Design a protein around this ligand. Structure first.
Ligand SMILES: Nc1nc2nc(C(=O)N[C@@H](Cc3ccc(F)cc3)C(=O)O)cnc2c(=O)[nH]1
Ligand SMILES: Nc1nc2nc(C(=O)N[C@@H](Cc3ccc(F)cc3)C(=O)O)cnc2c(=O)[nH]1
Length: 263
C-alpha cells in the first residue's frame, strides 16, 4: 500500500544518494502547498491513513536490508522492519499510536519500544550526543547491519540508538534541508566519515521554529530573528525567508497560508 523508496550504501555515490533524497521528498510532499518557494508537508488534520506513511528500504554491502517507516506530515522515523520483526518508538500521542498499527501488518513479531524516538532520548541511550556521532556512508552501512541484528541480541541498546541517530540525519534531516543533504553528499564524495558540525546541529534543532517563522512571516519577514550557527560555531541571524530558500527543502505544516494582498 504505502510507497517504497530504495537506497543502498553498497557502492553509493553522490548521484545515487541525490536520486534517493529527491525520491523521498517526492513521496513526502504532494505539491499542494508551496510557500515562498518552499514546499510544506501534508497537514495531519484530516489526512487519510492510507496516505500517512512512506517506506524507506535500506540495503547495504553486507547484503542486509531494513525498512524504515516515515510519517509524511513531519518525515519522522516512527519505526523499522528487519525480516520477521518490527520495532516502533513509543508514540507521542493516541493518533500516532493508532497510525502505527497500519504499518508492517503481516510481520510476525511487533514491538513497541518503551522509549520515544526524539534525539534527546536517543542520545541518552547512545551515551553520545549528535555532535560526537560520525555520519557518512560507512556509518550508514554499519547502522543498517546494527538495526538488522537487534532482534537476535547482536546489537546492544547504545549501538541501536546511535544507529537510529545516523539514519534519521542521513534520511529525514537530509530530506528536510538541502544544506544537510549537501553535507552528506560531501561525505559520500570523499568517503570520509565525520560528526555533524554546529551548522548541521542548529539547523536540525531549528526546523520546527523555522517552519513556523516562515509560515507566520509578514510577506517573508520574520517578526523575531532566529539564531543559527556557521560551521565554525559563530552565530548569525535569520530575518527573512529569502536566505533559507537554498537551505530548507521542506517544512512541517504550522498554520494556514494567508490570503494575497491585492490592489
Ligand atoms: N525518530 C525520529 N526522531 C527525530 N527526532 C528529532 C528531534 O529530536 N528533533 C529535536 C529538534 C529540537 C532540538 C532542540 C530544541 F530546543 C528544539 C527542537 C526536537 O524535536 O526536540 C527530529 N527528527 C526526528 C525524526 O525524523 N525521527
Ligand atoms: N509520527 C510521529 N510523529 C512525531 N512527531 C514528533 C514531533 O516532535 N512533532 C513536532 C513536529 C516536528 C517534527 C520533527 C522535528 F524535527 C521538529 C518538529 C510537533 O508535534 O510539532 C514527536 N514524536 C513523534 C512520534 O513519536 N511519532
Amino acid at each position: 500500500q504505502y510507497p517504497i523508496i530504495n537506497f543502498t550504501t553498497a557502492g553509493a555515490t553522490v548521484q545515487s544518494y541525490t536520486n534517493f533524497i529527491r525520491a523521498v521528498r517526492g513521496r513526502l510532499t504532494t505539491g499542494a502547498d508551496v510557500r515562498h518557494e518552499i514546499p510544506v508537508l501534508p497537514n495531519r488534520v484530516g489526512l487519510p491513513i492510507n496516505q500517512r506513511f512512506i517506506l524507506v528500504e535500506l540495503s547495504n554491502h553486507a547484503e542486509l536490508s531494513v525498512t524504515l517507516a516515515l510519517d509524511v506530515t513531519n518525515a519522522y522515523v516512527v519505526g523499522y522492519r528487519a525480516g520477521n520483526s518490527a520495532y516502533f518508538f513509543h508514540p507521542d500521542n493516541q493518533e500516532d499510536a493508532e497510525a502505527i498499527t497500519h504499518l508492517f501488518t503481516d510481520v510476525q513479531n511487533r514491538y513497541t519500544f518503551a522509549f520515544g524516538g526524539n534525539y534527546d532520548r536517543l542520545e541518552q541511550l547512545a551515551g553520545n550526543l549528535r555532535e560526537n556521532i560520525e555520519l557518512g556512508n560507512g556509518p550508514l552501512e554499519e547502522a543498517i547491519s546494527a538495526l538488522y541484528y537487534y532482534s537476535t541480541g547482536g546489537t546492544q541498546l547504545p549501538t541501536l540508538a546511535r544507529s537510529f541517530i545516523i539514519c534519521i540525519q542521513m534520511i529525514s534531516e537530509a530530506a528536510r534541508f538541502q544544506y544537510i543533504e549537501g553535507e552528506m553528499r560531501t561525505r559520500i564524495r570523499y568517503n570520509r566519515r565525520s560528526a555533524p558540525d554546529p551548522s548541521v546541529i542548529t539547523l536540525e534543532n531549528s526546523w520546527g521554529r523555522l517552519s513556523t517563522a516562515i509560515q507566520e512571516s509578514n510577506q517573508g519577514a520574520f517578526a523575531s530573528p532566529i539564531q543559527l550557527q556557521r560551521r565554525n560555531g559563530s552565530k548569525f541571524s535569520v530575518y527573512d525567508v529569502s536566505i533559507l530558500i537554498p537551505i530548507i527543502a521542506l517544512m512541517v505544516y504550522r498554520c494556514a497560508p494567508p490570503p494575497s494582498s491585492q490592489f
